Amino acid sequence: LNPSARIMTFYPTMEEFRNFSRYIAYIESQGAHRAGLAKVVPPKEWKPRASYDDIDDLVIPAPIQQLVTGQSGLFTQYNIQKKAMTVREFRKIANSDKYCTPRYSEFEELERKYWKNLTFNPPIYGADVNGTLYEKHVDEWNIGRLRTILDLVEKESGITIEGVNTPYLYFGMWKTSFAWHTEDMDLYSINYLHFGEPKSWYSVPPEHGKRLERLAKGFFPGSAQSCEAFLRHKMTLISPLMLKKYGIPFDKVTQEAGEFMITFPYGYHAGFNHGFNCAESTNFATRRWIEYGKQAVLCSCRKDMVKISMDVFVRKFQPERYKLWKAGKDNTVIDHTLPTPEAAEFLK
Numbered sequence: 001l002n003p004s005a006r007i008m009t010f011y012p013t014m015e016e017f018r019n020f021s022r023y024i025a026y027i028e029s030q031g032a033h034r035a036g037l038a039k040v041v042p043p044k045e046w047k048p049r050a051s052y053d054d055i056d057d058l059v060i061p062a063p064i065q066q067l068v069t070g071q072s073g074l075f076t077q078y079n080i081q082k083k084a085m086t087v088r089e090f091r092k093i094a095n096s097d098k099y100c101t102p103r104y105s106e107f108e109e110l111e112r113k114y115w116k117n118l119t120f121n122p123p124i125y126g127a128d129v130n131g132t133l134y135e136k137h138v139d140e141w142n143i144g145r146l147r148t149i150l151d152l153v154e155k156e157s158g159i160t161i162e163g164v165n166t167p168y169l170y171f172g173m174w175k176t177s178f179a180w181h182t183e184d185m186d187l188y189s190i191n192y193l194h195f196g197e198p199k200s201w202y203s204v205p206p207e208h209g210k211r212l213e214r215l216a217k218g219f220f221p222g223s224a225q226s227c228e229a230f231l232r233h234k235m236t237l238i239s240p241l242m243l244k245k246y247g248i249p250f251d252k253v254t255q256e257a258g259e260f261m262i263t264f265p266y267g268y269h270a271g272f273n274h275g276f277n278c279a280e281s282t283n284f285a286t287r288r289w290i291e292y293g294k295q296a297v298l299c300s301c302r303k304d305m306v307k308i309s310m311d312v313f314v315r316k317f318q319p320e321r322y323k324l325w326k327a328g329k330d331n332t333v334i335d336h337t338l339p340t341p342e343a344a345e346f347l348k
């Protein structure tokens with residue numbers, strides 16, 4: 001299904017919305033994953049928090065200034081870590097005249113304005129903020145406790161990886177952006193926009209991901225030579241025109257507050273924020289992810305980079321292949337079109 005591999009949008013009834021893992025299996029049964037990105041707007045009823053009128057005092061330990069360098073569709077973004085500041089301090093700076101959002105009509109306007117000025121007046125981003133905004137009593141899509149097989153990591157080793165198996169908060173500003181990248185260990189990803197201005201996304205189908213990396217290695221040969229997966233550095237930005245110019249299939253979508261965004265294994269994505277906003281995210285997994293995790297090409301030039309031991313997952317879900325795998329003979333090939341095993345129920 002979804003032979004065009006286009007970004008899909010889902011409107012779940014409060015009944016379908018209850019079980020996270022199930023609905024994920026459902027959208028995968030509808031081919032949503034073939035796009036790499038999918039949108040899911042919660043039932044008109046559901047709300048994760050009562051009011052965001054208290055966060056103004058919340059602190060951002062390390063906001064970053066985004067310096068972008070480049071021309072004609074290709075840019076490298078550098079990070080200048082700033083001094084701690086509150087959401088209030090941030091909102092004032094984000095709303096000031098200098099970092100304010102430009103006036104526009106159609107989205108295609110803000111888009112061209114973005115790719116035209118991303119190298120000027122470097123903005124601030126309140127990213128990687130350890131925390132959650134969900135109310136401890138919410139049992140639907142709580143980024144703090146999704147209850148997926150990714151919990152196996154902490155259960156078996158006690159290991160915690162901030163932002164991956166724990167929630168991260170991102171306070172946006174106009175022109176703040178996220179470079180092209182797949183999730184760490186090529187995991188799944190969930191992003192919820194609590195409030196504020198929109199956040200636009202660009203996505204490349206997992207079945208075409210390799211083409212995007214070939215293009216990236218060609219434009220950034222130096223970075224490519226220094227690292228087997230420099231794109232994981234999240235410093236590379238590439239405009240849509242540049243992708244079109246080289247036949248790279250991709251889709252666009254805008255995430256407004258109260259909506260969910262789901263990225264799938266090996267799905268390349270990128271985008272930028274329209275203005276001041278808050279977003280919460282974390283990674284998660286399904287049985288299907290295991291193979292992706294086993295084959296994930298990781299960063300080889302940085303100590304920091306995330307690396308999960310697949311051992312425990314292969315043992316529990318791929319016992320017949322464990323021995324062959326530890327011997328390096330598991331030559332399984334991945335079919336990015338196949339839905340996760342758990343979707344069987346919705347395929348009868």
Ligand SMILES: O=C(O)c1ccnc2c(O)cccc12
Binds near residue numbers: 177191
């Ligand atoms: O900055 C974002 O809003 C964002 C969107 C999608 N994925 C992200 C990520 O994987 C790491 C940090 C930020 C993002």
Ligand SMILES: [Cl-]
Binds near residue numbers: 219220221222223224
């Ligand atoms: Cl280079």
Ligand code: NI
Binds near residue numbers: 181182183189263
């Ligand atoms: Ni991401």
Ligand SMILES: [Zn+2]
Binds near residue numbers: 226230233299300
């Ligand atoms: Zn690297």
